[PDB]
Structure 1
Amino acid sequence: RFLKVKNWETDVVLTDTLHLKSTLETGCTEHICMGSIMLPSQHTRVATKDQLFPLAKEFLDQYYSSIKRFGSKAHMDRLEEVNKEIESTSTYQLKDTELIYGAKHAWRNASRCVGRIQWSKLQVFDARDCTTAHGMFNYICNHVKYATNKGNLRSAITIFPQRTDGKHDFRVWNSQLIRYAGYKQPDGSTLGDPANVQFTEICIQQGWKAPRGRFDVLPLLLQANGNDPELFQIPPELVLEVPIRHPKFDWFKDLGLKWYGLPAVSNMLLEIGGLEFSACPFSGWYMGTEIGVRDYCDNSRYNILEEVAKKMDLDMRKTSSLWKDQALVEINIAVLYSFQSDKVTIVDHHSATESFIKHMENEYRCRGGCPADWVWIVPPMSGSITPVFHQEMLNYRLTPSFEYQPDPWNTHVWK
């Protein structure tokens, strides 16, 4: 109730009181810790009219307290105002300013995100007036253009109409706005991104004509107000890409690798005051390792370690030659150098984890804590030589938040 987290590389000590305001549950118990379960049963997402006003009052009480007007008349009138609208319609509508606050704090409370030092500079695009798949395509294009900003990336979220009944639900079926396609081969191996093989054939199912190459940017599949989703191709000039080259190894270009500049996740759900926004794509910029470690070297992904190590002339017989580690560092030096040479915003895992420690200092000071998931904060390479490896972290679930949600193609009453 006044718990302490220690840093063991600096002996810095911090006191968490923010975990007291925590509301959601973790999945752990006194006799079990599930801190390494990937999609815990609590991190996923239907609510009745009854539970909705405590959730609104809870939200509005932090909102007005945050603009130095806690408990005043403007706050009490708004509590009553929402109360009455939840009487009338059994739901309610957020003010524009309450929507911006709730979105910025969902990101703030995302314990698995190492980038949250920037949480307050989030551009919020209100798309709650949207009604059709084409309207969503327009909103998403304007999002992609704004956030990309010619390589000077800017953080943003686009918020589509909230869930109401549950059957009229806006959904982006893509897991990200910009993703490369995955194609299964006759022999069984995979061209493109294996992660998206199931989605790539859903697009062909709905009528996509696939170029059947490596880095083919998938189309968007947009579902508006419960209707069946529709295909649209993002204008190519809006999809900024970085060809990957090395600042020593000239043969690195021959690999013919590239990645997109904009990481923009679209399959998650934003929860604000008890309201659920099922379509809410949000974007930032990449930490290098998400591309060069996970995207490029996960076994179940592009899996390029063996062909990079070949061209490096590496001892690939013994596991203990660390040829895998050795080729992994070159691939990440290449992604960083490539993005930087092209003036596309990217951050390295050293600078981003030093920034998160800096962020943690600020949240324990001006908020009394920072929910943080070590399993996810620690970068996927060189963990112990980044300062977050030695920083104890308390994980707890605060709201507003981002939550996972099932894929629409396994839950949609089709047609």
Structure 2
Amino acid sequence: RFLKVKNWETDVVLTDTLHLKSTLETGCTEHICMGSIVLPVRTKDQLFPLAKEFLDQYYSSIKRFGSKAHMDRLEEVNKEIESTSTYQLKDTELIYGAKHAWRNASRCVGRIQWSKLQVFDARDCTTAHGMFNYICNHVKYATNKGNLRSAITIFPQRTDGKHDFRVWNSQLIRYAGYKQPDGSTLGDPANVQFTEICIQQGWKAPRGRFDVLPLLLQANGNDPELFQIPPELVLEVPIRHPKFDWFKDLGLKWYGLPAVSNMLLEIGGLEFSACPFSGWYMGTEIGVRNYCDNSRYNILEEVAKKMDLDMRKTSSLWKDQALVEINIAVLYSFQSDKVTIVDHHSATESFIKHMENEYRCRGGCPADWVWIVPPMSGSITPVFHQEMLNYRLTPSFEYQPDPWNTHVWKG
């Protein structure tokens, strides 16, 4: 079967066949769409088909499908599964698999970049100290003094589900949040609960507005351990505005390195529960969401007060006005310090070229419109006007429950 998508600005129509390779389920049915819902231990029996389907894809991609090497590898994996209940990926398969999980991530606007990903194989790691070292090397490499390079570090896969590797941080670099007795929050409200865990685990909190959190790292199902990232490895950008000289005195800064650490990477039915990955920011992530969400730094009012905007009626668009100036400030600041960042115009235009290329060479590009459209100025970006199809391909990144909810404390 063929599915068509239309761009309503260009009338360009594309045809999807790749959706036929999807088997995992969406949340939707013929009677309900769950497109805006945020969140909508394996047998031998289920594992070999998953391994086979992955190795078939890998061997096709290298133009060796049905070769002796392909068949010998299926045979070798089959025997390893029957003998040991699992199997190990070759380094080449791991690299391919991690690049493909990114290529297949339908909520990611930055996928034009998917084939340039540095993969750090950390499957020989055994302790939380070893994980700390691996993560430092990833941060230093990816940062590259501001010229950011995408990278992922892949710790040992799940075995019985009782020996998982996990990074408890949701991203490698994040700012502490502290709920005050008077109900206000100091620092980032998104990280209050994780900050509390850190403190209980014995972190000495500086209690400021931008305290970089310590890593909490679990190796081999053991209780997690605290480590502080060397501050010299944490690149930060003070935020200022090209015209408004009072903007700097808001005291805002942000970190350069966005590095998601709470997702699970599935390749060939194997589960990598600790696979931190990093790219670079699109400016709206910081300027729109991190600064302006009501439940985050929530700076809209203070900025609009300083701009002397008419704040008595929402219809003056004061919030929209302040929003744009904050976002100019973020892009200006990153650019002035030579830290990689991309604006939402450039990123979405590149995504559309990526998507057309995918349709032409791969037969499709699963994309989640709800997430791809930027959180400001939606319809003046080309993605707003682009019909998209969302479906689930493996290899994939997946959500997983936060580890403090599931961990069995050894004590």
Other-structure match for 2:212:
217
Distance in 2 between residues matched to 1:47 and 1:380, nearest whole Å: 38
Residue 48 of structure 1: how far off its partner (Å): 1.5
Distance in 2 between residues matched to 1:64 and 1:281, nearest whole Å: 26
Q: Secondary structure at the match of 1:309?
A: helix
Other-structure match for 2:399:
404
Q: Secondary structure at the match of 2:153?
A: strand
Residue 38 of structure 1: how far off its partner (Å): 0.5
Deviations 1:255-279 (A, max 9, x none): 0100000000000000000000000
Deviations 1:305-324 (A, max 9, x none): 00000000011111111100
The count of corresponding residues between Structure 1 and Structure 2 is 410
Deviations 1:12-70 (A, max 9, x none): 11000000111111010011110000011xxxxx3212100000000000000000101
| Unmatched 5+ stretches in structure 2 | none
Distance in 2 between residues matched to 1:11 and 1:215, nearest whole Å: 46
Other-structure match for 2:286:
291
Residue 112 of structure 1: how far off its partner (Å): 0.2
* Matching residue within 305, 308, 313 for 2:308: 313
Distance in 2 between residues matched to 1:229 and 1:289, nearest whole Å: 33
Distance in 1 between residues matched to 2:34 and 2:265, nearest whole Å: 23
Residue 375 of structure 1: how far off its partner (Å): 0.4
Distance in 1 between residues matched to 2:277 and 2:91, nearest whole Å: 17
Q: Secondary structure at the match of 2:131?
A: helix
Distance in 2 between residues matched to 1:21 and 1:171, nearest whole Å: 30
> 1:110 aligned to 2:86?
no
Distance in 1 between residues matched to 2:97 and 2:115, nearest whole Å: 11
Q: Cα RMSD (Å) of the superposition?
A: 0.5
Residue 240 of structure 1: how far off its partner (Å): 0.1
Other-structure match for 1:13:
13
Residue 297 of structure 1: how far off its partner (Å): 0.4
Distance in 2 between residues matched to 1:229 and 1:97, nearest whole Å: 30
Kindly report structure 1 stretches of 4+ aligned residues shifted beyond 3 Å. none
Other-structure match for 2:335:
340
Other-structure match for 1:356:
351
Deviations 1:224-258 (A, max 9, x none): 00000000000000000000000000000110100
Residue 187 of structure 1: how far off its partner (Å): 1.0
Residue 150 of structure 1: how far off its partner (Å): 0.3
Distance in 2 between residues matched to 1:248 and 1:288, nearest whole Å: 18
Distance in 1 between residues matched to 2:118 and 2:76, nearest whole Å: 27
Q: Secondary structure at the match of 2:345?
A: helix
Normalization by structure 1: what TM-score? 0.98
Q: Secondary structure at the match of 2:383?
A: helix
Residue 151 of structure 1: how far off its partner (Å): 0.1
Distance in 1 between residues matched to 2:327 and 2:9, nearest whole Å: 25
Q: Secondary structure at the match of 1:270?
A: strand
Q: Secondary structure at the match of 1:158?
A: strand
Distance in 1 between residues matched to 2:42 and 2:395, nearest whole Å: 15
Deviations 1:316-368 (A, max 9, x none): 11111110000000000000000000000000000000000000011001100
> 1:4 aligned to 2:18?
no
Distance in 2 between residues matched to 1:261 and 1:302, nearest whole Å: 17
Normalization by structure 2: what TM-score? 0.99
Distance in 1 between residues matched to 2:93 and 2:251, nearest whole Å: 46
Distance in 2 between residues matched to 1:188 and 1:321, nearest whole Å: 30
Distance in 1 between residues matched to 2:348 and 2:30, nearest whole Å: 30
Distance in 1 between residues matched to 2:152 and 2:109, nearest whole Å: 18
Distance in 2 between residues matched to 1:380 and 1:258, nearest whole Å: 20
Deviations 1:72-109 (A, max 9, x none): 11000000000000010010000000000000000000
Distance in 2 between residues matched to 1:372 and 1:404, nearest whole Å: 17
Residue 402 of structure 1: how far off its partner (Å): 0.1
Q: Secondary structure at the match of 2:356?
A: helix
Distance in 2 between residues matched to 1:283 and 1:154, nearest whole Å: 8
* Matching residue within 260, 265, 268 for 2:260: 265
% same residue: 99
Distance in 2 between residues matched to 1:180 and 1:113, nearest whole Å: 23
Distance in 2 between residues matched to 1:159 and 1:82, nearest whole Å: 20
Residue 186 of structure 1: how far off its partner (Å): 1.9
